[PDB]
Amino acid sequence: GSDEDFVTCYSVLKFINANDGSRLHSHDVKYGSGSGQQSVTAVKNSDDINSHWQIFPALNAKCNRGDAIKCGDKIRLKHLTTGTFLHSHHFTAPLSKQHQEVSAFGSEAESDTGDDWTVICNGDEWLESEQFKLRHAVTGSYLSLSGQQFGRPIHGQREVVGTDSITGGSAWKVAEGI
């Protein structure tokens, strides 16, 4: 585990849930409850283009491709196939009423503070070999699998939400898709 296998700005990768093994995912399927924006799920379906995300500097920051990301810093995550950003806000989750909704919103042009996520890793340089959490900057909610699964038209996909506290679905791990 070379101490220099850090995650870099503008790198493209997959986010795997540590305890479930599912990959953070998005698609052209919108919610029919909260904000009605594009949904975000976790899939138990390896290697899929819709599971790739690109790390962007925080909304009011800037970075250079190849730049290491320090723990504690905020980032934005762009869903490659739809050009949207991992987003959160004050809406209720689709299947878990007690939780906050997590969506894929806007684009580089429409991106706002709601797209910022604080990287929670130990030490001070996001390593590709460590587990981490992502805490929504504006609301403070942790990106987590609610433990619920969807039915058709996205059967078996796990619900992704924002939890006030850290749960057994809050730990994530990075992996190089391509």
Say if strands 172-175 and 131-136 run parallel, antiparallel, or are unpaired. antiparallel
Residues with Cβ within 8 Å of residue 90, at least 6 apart in sequence: 100, 139
**Nearest-angstrom CA–CA distance, 16 and 2:** 20
CATH number of the domain encompassing residue 37: 2.80.10.50
Amino acid, single-letter form, for residue 129: S
CA dihedral 151, 152, 158, 162 (to 10 degrees): -90
3-state secondary structure 62-114: CCCCCCECCCCCEEEEEECCCCCEEEEEEEECCCCCCCEEEEEECCCCCCCHH
Task: Count up the domains in the chain and report the number.
Answer: 1
Structure tokens at 93: 């989750």
Nearest to 48 by CA among 167, 154, 165, 151: 154
Question: Do residues 162 and 93 make contact, with C-beta atoms less than 8 angstroms apart?
Answer: yes
Integer angstrom CA distances of residue 71 from 116, 133, 155 = 14, 10, 35
* Structure token digits, residue 28: 């052209």
Q: Phi and psi dihedrals of 49, rounded to 5?
A: -55, -30
| Residue 96, phi-psi category: left (phi > 0), alpha (psi -120 to 50), beta (remainder) | beta
Technique behind the model: X-ray
Please name the amino acid found at residue 4: E
Please give the C-alpha separations between residue 144 and each of 77, 165, 167, in angstroms, as whole numbers: 15, 9, 7
Answer for the pair 112, 127: CB distance below 8 angstroms, yes or no: no
Query: Which residues lie across from 104 on neighbouring strands?
Result: 38, 86
Closest CA to 159 of 68, 93, 72: 93
Beta bridge partners of 174: 15
**Distance set, CA 165 to CA 131, 134, 138, 140, 169 (Å):** 17, 12, 15, 9, 10
- Provide the domain limits for residue 20: 1-178
Question: What letter would DSSP give residue 3?
Answer: T
